[PDB]
Design a protein around this ligand. Structure first.
Ligand code: BO2
Ligand code: MG
Ligand code: MG
Ligand code: MG
Lengths: 240, 244, 222, 195, 212, 233, 231, 235
């Protein structure tokens, strides 16, 4: 078998293949995650260079791992499918043996462990993908939002963004998000998520996708018209 | 040892691109243009054979359009030999699904499976990727008529109208201009041929330089028919649309 | 058909004292109605103040002892010459025995020594590794003859105090090393009389804080 | 385990399964639910050798739930039954086969029809209006042959099911400790708590 | 062997006998048929001594690894299923095990799972397992209520093992009592049947058949 | 698992004051057929060890090749191969015992009973038994097969315990072995008159005697035995 | 230069640079001395510390009751090789009831190290070993190099500044060989030998490490206040 | 290119030496051993204020009597921790006892050099393994990707290591109490850290014979930080 060590250290103590995988994430479309008091919202950018697309059948950016957890990403689309499939298999395996669905932290730890494994295994390159994993633990009403990256490190975030121009939207979230009082309602949380994407997106038409996840496996994806109403209200308040 | 001669086909560039995928896409950009157009009552697949000869036996020839099952077909852009490897794998996958569930495979599931195979060659194994881009035209009872494309990266996307191979930039602009949502198959046939006729590097578009196919519900009652056009049938539709 | 098991007879006996422990065993080795040897040592010093005997099928018995002695050696190498405690040895032996759960060592194993508080310890095993710390245990062919006698004369079972008539039990006073050796010798003499696979000689290993001592006694050779 | 019954009526499928679990000479439990929900509109009951039954049922459950998440779509009862049959057909030529017989009751939301499939441990699948595994059918099929009509309501199906259980309680030697009854229709799966 | 466990108001009572036999030969009267998996989990042993004791000792290692990895104690459901899935892999090889996995957690409350070597895994309120299980069932079923005091529940468990120790030839020796609560299990002593029988006979007025 | 085909009968042996004696007849039986009359079943290893083998002859020849190969291997990169680092009886035995127990554990035994007789470096007598089951034991006298039942009783009258070994000379020990071989010829239906005998002494070394015969047999009394009870003629 | 990328490449003058670079790792290691008489064999090792808070790296490893070694270079490689020796000593005991000859132990180490110098992918061992032992032919001392070369000697030293101790032993050859039935005097000679390799630092109580094996003396290691006697 | 297991002309493994450079870039971790216990402390170093700092897990339990702190590419530590936990629990299963801290460390270090062309590269993380056993008492070990481990009375690893180690050189003595050690870790962490030290960006832990391994609450650490400020202002 092909056993070549692709991910290796350099004289300055860097693993360039892992670092170049982050550059692939930097190229990917922007993804954002914001958790409120009783919800988490996942915002995703759709680049409008591709029109004549069939939005019914085109792979959506946000993927359900289980009925209570979701996963969005930035980076290589093909790579993301492999992580999502493994995550979905592990979710069912956990239910089968532990007789309880995965916690959001556990699922994140698994996905992060897969990513790490691909940074010191022979004959493989790292995943060019960073993920945002969000949801609610079984029988728990505390919102959960985690991030992973090609190196395999993961951590919890009150709010976070990844992908292209993520530096800008992170700048926005850092000044606008208050920890002592997070978005109390679904409306406030979605509004803040759409606002953060409007700093980068371009047009607020079909370029913004929003997915709201609530406790007890209550997940729903907002439509174009529903999102367009948020876009309208934000700019009308801005004209002042 | 052997390390000396390894090209390392599955690595990132400093910019975060996959060298071999990018170079495979460059190869595909010189291949004959293939176009897919999805309508409300069917799907059209049109493709240009590359600089043919008068001594090529056309009626028994097949380099662009292939049948995966009774409901799904593909248009090829790139290395034909690479494509046939993947086509035979896709045909088997469709039959495995049919044996397991006793139902025809949904289009997206077939597309995802092939796209995953392509992805694998970019991440592990140390082999070169498949220098192939597919346009998938298919039907199932969930989403109805569907158009997809996949490329050597293993990434796939859904489309209303799409082109692969040569002059896709020019072709996509023309499709984006004249395409409408309430369009029908007969109109889509005309759009496909007109787009090829303008983007072609050849002097004139003729029957012997084309492969053509449709997937219609235009079959007796609730069912789907695949029609791979014969040379004479391509010649007739060229006269009908007013190109020759 | 090939039968991979055999029966080499013999009998063993472990008794735990207050600050000592003994492991005894006869020196006769047999197959069917023949004597192989009148003196074939069966109880072994395994190091770290632990004595061991694996009675039954001698080939499996030797194999197990050999592997445990090996385990003690590697325990020293891997853990900075640390002394293997009797409880740790017992758990290790369980895994050696259960490792061959589906092709068992056909033996009854007994180890003896001192626990980490310096008190006398005897552990007893079945062929597939189930074990238990005991104050008293006989093993092997004549185990059914010896154990009841030890229940009576070591644990004072079914004994009460005169005058009270079944009301007050006989108190469980501790036994000295001289008192235990008497019970061991009488156990084996009695077993030799009524069991054909027991005889020739008795070898006793006594374990104290000072180390491992040996005593040998003649048994009837018929 | 012992008795599992199935009946497909006009607009639903009804599965009845005994509550007893017996090992040797003791009834260890009298409230055991011998079924698993594979999907919102598909239920599978099971009976066979101890351990194998639950292990197989939960394995199938996990696979269908995995499919549901991956495609965001519920498989048809026919598709699920074919998947289950293939697993059992694969199993019968294994080193140690799954010794499990199953009934699959589902409501096809596409065709708006209830469907009942009987599959044994060999991988023998049949679609039926009513079915049973083990010695149950030796009693219940004669009753069902007489009374069953294809346009029965759910309430009529339950009454006909009570007549089956009454016959079993009269003539079968084993005390199976009654049955848990579940109904599968367009609205999903629900349990009849009083039977 | 006679082992039982039952749920009640004050948690769980676990009671076991102490006898081990090889045919008609009494191999031991001092066997520990309850295994302390952790301060909140107990396992009972019936059938093959080595099988039960090896794999329940092994189960404790798996449970300890779970709480190290997950920073949270393992559920009784998950602990029982680790054992049942393990023995299921060995099915047909000839393992002989009849066990109860007994514990308490916040999410579950007091829980008992019957796990055996055929792969059977059952949640329940009352279980008796072993050669003398039928004898224990007689006393338990006629006297069981949810509203039992810790003191009365303990005696019922003790008395049920005694009943089986008397009638079942392969049960006896002594009775080990455990009481599992919200704050963990609590050992309640070794009770020799040789003394317990006469004590119960005199005080309770039972066993009038026997002469004393 | 198999069955023995061509077989060798008893191997007998004992210790004496300065060494050990071992003997075995020269027969290779094929069931009740006394097929091969020139089979050597005592195989010397160096000048300090003799391995006597009974049971399956095909497995004996395999073991013979292993020992031959063992000597070759020991000589490799060994300047003291004919001195301090020569093969000892204890080394040879332990090797065989390992192989025998390994083979029985794979359910494919070498169908033999083996006695390794020799003298160690320090002059100590070595005599130990091993068989197809991997069972091992040592004793002042050792014998396989019928020898165990008939030879041991006779040899144990000479050396009954360890303290009798220094009191037993080589002449007395050899006499007892030769008598035992005669008794086996009287009573073992799968024995032959012809046998080999080997003495390993700490002083005089290895003495290997071939083509020995059972002699001084008592048969004359047979003429007086008539009928099976009542018959007079 | 161009021929040092891997172990599978000879240079134009017939040299194996990766093996030579592995040899260099030994020279960087702390000094250790080995010497023997007819009755006993002694190892003396100067242990090295990272800093004042750190412990002094152990240099001596026991392989059997009658054999052991001292290391200089990559310690993990010494652990791998010593583990192999333990197994080989143990195989000899279990199968043949025979204590492994020190000469044969050297042959086994040579062959194990050699395979790593001829195959692609692997690397040479980066450690040198001094093996002492007492077997059926008396006391022995071996020097192991990861090139594969093993040499039996009366005395030697390896590591940094080892040339000083090696010269001393070359002068003292006739004296220390005669130290029979006197372990303390043989150790004294070893401690005096390793002292010739010292600069700036001197032998302290937690710095020095000594081991001995002999006629009626199992392989035992002395550290801490047990070696204060010899300082 | 060149082999992964290649020696440099100086006699060092290139990849091992390069992994040590990655560890220097890592966040600071400090360990101090006393007769009353061993203290382990780390710098969390959150990359952004939106990152919930309590999810940063750089101090980890291996067993009840053994704890562990990390520095460098912390993702690489997960398989090392898993192995350590398994080794600890497995030894308890085989021997019915706690495993020695040194033996546990040795088991972890056996993984280190299992790389070639096994894993494709060395670990890019250093570990401070602290614990207690009956034989050698309270112990602190520094496990490197070279496969080498040193025992230490006190040790600092990460970006501010040489500065912290020099400070530990002067401050450590054999009669230190547990409380004195806790404050000393906090003092040195505060010195080498970029951002100002508080309970949210720094974490403490200890291992004692009685209570075993414990990660300190943010409320408990906050008091020790306040106690530190006052005693420094006292002179
Ligand atoms: B109990 O009777 O099931 C008992 C429990 C076990 C934990 C000691 N088992 C045994 O006594 C078994 C035999 C048996 C008797 C009756 C039913 C089932 C099994 N005996 C042993 O496991 C055993 C162990 N060591 C020595 C002898 N016998
Ligand atoms: Mg007799
Ligand atoms: Mg059927
Ligand atoms: Mg398991």
């Amino acid at each position: 078998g092909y056993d070549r060590a692709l991910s290796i250290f350099s004289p300055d103590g860097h693993i360039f293949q892992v670092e170049y995988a982050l550059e692939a994430v930097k190229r990917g479309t922007c993804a954002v995650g914001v958790k409120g008091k009783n919800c988490v919202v996942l915002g995703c950018e759709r680049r409008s260079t591709l029109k004549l697309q069939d939005t019914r059948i085109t792979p959506s950016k946000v993927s359900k791992i289980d009925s209570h957890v979701v996963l969005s990403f930035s980076g290589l689309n093909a790579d993301s499918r492999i992580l999502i499939e493994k995550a979905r298999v592990e979710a069912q395996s956990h239910r089968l043996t532990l007789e309880d669905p995965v916690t959001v932290e556990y699922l994140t730890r698994y996905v992060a462990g897969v990513q790490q494994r691909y940074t010191q295994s022979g004959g493989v390159r790292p995943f060019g993908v960073s993920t945002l994993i969000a949801g609610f633990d079984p029988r728990d009403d505390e919102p959960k939002l985690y991030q992973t990256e090609p190196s395999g490190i993961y951590s919890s975030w009150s709010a976070q963004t990844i992908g292209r121009n993520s530096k800008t939207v992170r700048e926005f979230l850092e000044k606008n998000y208050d920890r002592k009082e997070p978005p109390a309602t679904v409306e406030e949380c979605v509004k803040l998520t759409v606002r953060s994407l409007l700093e980068v997106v371009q047009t607020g038409a079909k370029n913004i996708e929003i997915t709201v996840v609530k406790p007890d496996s209550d997940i729903v994806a907002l439509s174009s018209e529903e999102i367009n109403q948020y876009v309208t209200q934000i700019e009308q308040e801005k004209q002042e | 040892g052997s390390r000396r001669y390894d090209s390392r086909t599955t690595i990132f560039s400093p910019e975060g691109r996959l060298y071999q995928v990018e170079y495979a896409l460059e190869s595909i950009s010189h291949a004959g243009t293939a176009i897919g157009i999805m309508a409300s009552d069917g799907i059209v697949l049109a493709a240009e054979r590359k600089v043919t000869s008068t001594l090529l036996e056309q009626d028994t020839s097949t380099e662009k359009l292939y049948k995966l099952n009774d409901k799904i077909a593909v248009a090829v852009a790139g290395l034909t030999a690479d494509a046939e490897i993947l086509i035979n794998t896709a045909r088997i996958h469709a039959q495995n699904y049919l044996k397991t569930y006793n139902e025809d495979i949904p289009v997206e599931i077939l597309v995802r499976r092939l796209s995953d195979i392509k992805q694998g060659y970019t991440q592990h194994g140390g082999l070169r990727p498949f220098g192939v881009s597919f346009i998938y035209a298919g039907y199932d009872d969930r989403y109805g008529y569907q158009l997809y494309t996949s490329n050597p990266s293993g990434n796939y996307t859904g489309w209303k109208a799409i082109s692969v191979g040569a002059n896709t930039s020019a072709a996509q602009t023309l499709l984006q201009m004249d395409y409408k949502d309430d369009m029908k198959v007969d109109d889509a046939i005309e759009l496909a041929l007109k787009t090829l006729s303008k983007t072609t590097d050849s002097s004139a578009l003729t029957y012997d330089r084309l492969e053509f196919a449709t997937i219609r519900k235009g079959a007796n009652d609730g069912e789907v028919y695949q029609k791979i056009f014969k040379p004479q049938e391509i010649k007739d539709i060229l006269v009908k649309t007013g190109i020759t | 058909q090939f039968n991979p098991y055999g029966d080499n007879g013999g009998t063993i006996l472990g008794i735990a004292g207050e600050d000592f422990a003994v492991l005894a065993g006869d020196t006769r080795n047999i197959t069917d109605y023949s004597i192989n040897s009148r003196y074939e040592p069966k109880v072994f010093d395994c190091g770290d103040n632990i004595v061991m005997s694996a009675n039954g099928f001698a080939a499996d018995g030797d194999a197990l002892v050999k592997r445990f002695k090996n385990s003690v050696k590697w325990y020293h190498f891997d853990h900075n010459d640390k002394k293997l405690s009797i409880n740790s040895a017992a758990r290790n032996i369980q895994h050696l025995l259960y490792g061959k759960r589906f092709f068992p060592y056909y033996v009854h194993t007994i180890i003896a020594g001192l626990d980490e508080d310096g008190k006398g310890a005897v552990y007893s095993f079945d062929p597939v590794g189930s074990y238990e710390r005991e104050q008293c245990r006989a093993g092997g062919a004549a185990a059914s003859l010896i154990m009841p006698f030890l229940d009576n004369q070591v644990n004072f079972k079914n004994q009460y105090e005169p005058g009270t008539n079944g009301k007050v039990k006989k108190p469980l006073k501790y036994l000295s090393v001289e008192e235990v050796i008497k019970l061991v010798r009488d156990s084996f003499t009695s077993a030799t009389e009524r069991h054909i696979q027991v005889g020739d000689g008795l070898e006793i290993l006594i374990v104290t804080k000072d180390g491992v001592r040996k005593e040998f006694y003649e048994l009837k050779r018929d | 385990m012992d008795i599992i019954l199935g009946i497909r009526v006009q607009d639903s499928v009804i599965l009845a399964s005994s509550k007893a679990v017996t090992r040797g000479i003791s009834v260890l439990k009298d409230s055991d639910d011998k079924t698993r929900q594979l999907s919102p509109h598909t239920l599978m009951s099971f009976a066979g050798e101890a351990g194998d039954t639950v292990q197989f049922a939960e394995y199938i459950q996990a696979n269908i739930q995995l499919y549901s998440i991956r495609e965001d779509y519920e498989l048809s009862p026919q598709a699920v039954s074919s998947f289950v049959r293939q697993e059992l057909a694969k199993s019968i030529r294994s080193r140690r086969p799954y010794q499990v017989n199953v009934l699959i009751g589902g409501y096809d939301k596409k065709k708006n029809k209830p469907e009942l499939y009987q599959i044994d441990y060999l991988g023998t699948k049949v679609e039926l209006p009513y079915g049973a595994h083990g010695y149950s059918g030796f009693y219940t099929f004669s009753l069902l042959d007489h009374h069953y009509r294809p346009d029965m309501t759910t309430e009529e199906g339950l009454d006909l099911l009570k007549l089956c259980v009454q016959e079993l309680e009269k003539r079968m030697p084993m005390d199976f400790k009654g049955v848990i009854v579940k109904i599968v229709d367009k609205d999903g799966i629900r349990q009849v708590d009083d039977f | 062997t006679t082992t039982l466990a039952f749920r009640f108001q004050g948690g769980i009572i676990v009671a076991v006998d102490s006898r081990a036999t090889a045919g008609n030969w009494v191999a031991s009267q001092t066997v520990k048929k309850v295994i302390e998996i952790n301060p909140f989990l107990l396992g009972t042993t019936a059938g093959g001594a080595a099988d039960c004791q090896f794999w329940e000792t092994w189960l404790g290692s798996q449970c300890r690894l779970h709480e190290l990895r997950e920073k949270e104690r393992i559920s009784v459901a998950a602990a029982s299923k680790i054992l049942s899935n393990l023995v299921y892999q060995y099915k047909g090889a000839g393992l002989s095990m009849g066990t109860m996995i007994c514990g308490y957690t916040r999410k579950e409350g007091p829980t008992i799972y019957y796990v055996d070597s055929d792969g059977t895994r059952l949640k329940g309120d009352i279980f008796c397992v072993g050669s003398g299980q039928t004898f224990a069932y007689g006393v338990l079923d006629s006297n069981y209520k949810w509203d039992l005091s810790v003191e009365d529940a303990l005696y019922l468990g003790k008395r049920s093992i005694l009943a089986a120790a008397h009638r079942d030839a392969y049960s006896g020796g002594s009775v080990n009592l455990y009481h599992v609560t919200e704050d963990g299990w609590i050992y309640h002593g070794n009770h020799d049947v040789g003394e317990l029988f006469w004590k119960v006979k005199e005080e309770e007025g039972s066993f009038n058949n026997v002469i004393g | 698992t198999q069955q023995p085909i061509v077989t060798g009968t008893s191997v007998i042996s004992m210790k004496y004051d300065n060494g050990v004696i071992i003997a075995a007849d020269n027969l290779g039986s094929y069931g009740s057929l006394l097929r091969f009359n020139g089979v050597e079943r005592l195989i010397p290893v160096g000048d300090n060890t003799v391995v006597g083998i009974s049971g399956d002859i095909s497995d004996m020849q395999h073991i013979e090749r292993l020992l031959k190969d063992l000597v070759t291997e020991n000589a490799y990169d060994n300047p003291l191969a004919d001195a301090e680092e020569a093969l000892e009886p204890s080394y040879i035995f332990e090797y065989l015992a390992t192989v025998m127990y390994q083979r029985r554990s794979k359910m494919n035994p070498l169908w033999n009973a083996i006695i390794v007789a020799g003298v160690q470096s320090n002059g100590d007598q070595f005599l130990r038994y091993v068989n197809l089951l991997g069972v091992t034991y040592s004793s002042p006298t050792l014998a396989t097969g019928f020898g165990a039942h008939m030879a041991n009783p006779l040899l144990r009258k000479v050396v009954d315990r360890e303290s009798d070994i220094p009191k037993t000379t080589v002449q007395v020990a050899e006499e007892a072995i030769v008598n035992a071989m005669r008794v086996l010829y009287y009573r073992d239906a799968r024995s032959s008159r012809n046998f080999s005998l080997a003495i390993i002494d700490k002083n005089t070394g290895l003495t290997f005697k071939k083509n020995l015969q059972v002699e001084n047999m008592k048969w004359d009394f047979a003429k007086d035995i008539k009928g099976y009870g009542t018959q007079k003629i | 230069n161009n021929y040092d990328g891997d172990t599978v490449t000879f240079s134009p003058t017939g040299r194996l640079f990766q093996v030579e670079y592995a040899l260099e790792a030994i020279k960087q290691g702390s000094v250790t001395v080995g010497l023997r008489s007819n009755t006993h064999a002694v190892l003396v090792a100067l242990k090295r510390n990272a800093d004042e808070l750190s412990s002094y790296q152990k240099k001596i490893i026991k392989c059997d009751e009658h054999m052991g070694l001292s290391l200089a270079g990559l310690a993990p490689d010494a652990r791998v090789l010593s583990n192999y020796l333990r197994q080989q000593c143990n195989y000899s005991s279990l199968v043949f009831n025979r204590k492994l000859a020190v000469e044969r132990a050297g042959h086994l180490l040579c062959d194990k190290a050699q395979k790593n110098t001829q195959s692609y992918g692997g690397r040479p061992y980066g450690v040198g070993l001094l093996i002492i032992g007492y077997d059926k032919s008396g006391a022995h001392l071996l020097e192991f190099q990861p090139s594969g070369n093993v040499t039996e000697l009366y005395g030697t030293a390896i590591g940094a500044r080892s040339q000083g101790a090696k010269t001393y032993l070359e002068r003292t050859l006739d004296t220390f060989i005669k130290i029979d039935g006197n372990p303390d005097e043989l150790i004294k000679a070893g401690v005096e030998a390793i002292s010739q390799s010292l600069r700036d630092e001197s032998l302290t109580v937690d710095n020095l490490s000594i081991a001995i094996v002999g006629k009626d003396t199992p392989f035992t290691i002395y550290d801490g206040e047990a070696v204060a006697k010899y300082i | 290119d060149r082999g992964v297991s290649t020696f440099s002309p100086e006699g060092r493994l290139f990849q091992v030496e390069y992994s040590l450079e990655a560890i220097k870039l890592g966040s600071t971790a400090i360990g101090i051993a006393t007769k009353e216990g061993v203290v382990l402390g780390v710098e969390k170093r959150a990359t952004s204020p939106l990152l919930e700092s309590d999810s940063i897990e750089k101090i980890v339990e291996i067993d009840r009597h053994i704890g562990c702190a990390m520095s460098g590419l912390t993702a690489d530590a997960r398989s090392m921790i898993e192995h350590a936990r398994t080794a600890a629990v497995t030894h308890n299963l085989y021997y019915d006892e706690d495993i020695n801290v040194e033996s546990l460390t040795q088991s972890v270090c056996d993984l280190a050099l299992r790389f070639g062309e096994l894993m494709s590269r060395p670990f890019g993380v250093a570990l401070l393994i602290a614990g207690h056993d009956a034989d050698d008492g309270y112990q602190l070990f520094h496990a490197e990707p070279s496969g080498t481990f040193y025992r230490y009375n006190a040790k600092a690893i990460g970006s501010g290591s040489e500065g912290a180690q020099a400070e530990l050189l002067n401050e450590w003595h054999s009669s230190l109490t547990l409380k004195e050690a806790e404050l000393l870790v906090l003092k040195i962490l505060k010195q080498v850290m970029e951002e100002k030290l508080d309970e949210n960006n720094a974490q403490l832990s200890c291992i004692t014979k009685q209570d075993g391994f414990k990660i300190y609450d943010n409320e408990k650490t906050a008091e020790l930080i306040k106690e530190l400020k006052e005693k420094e202002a006292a002179e």
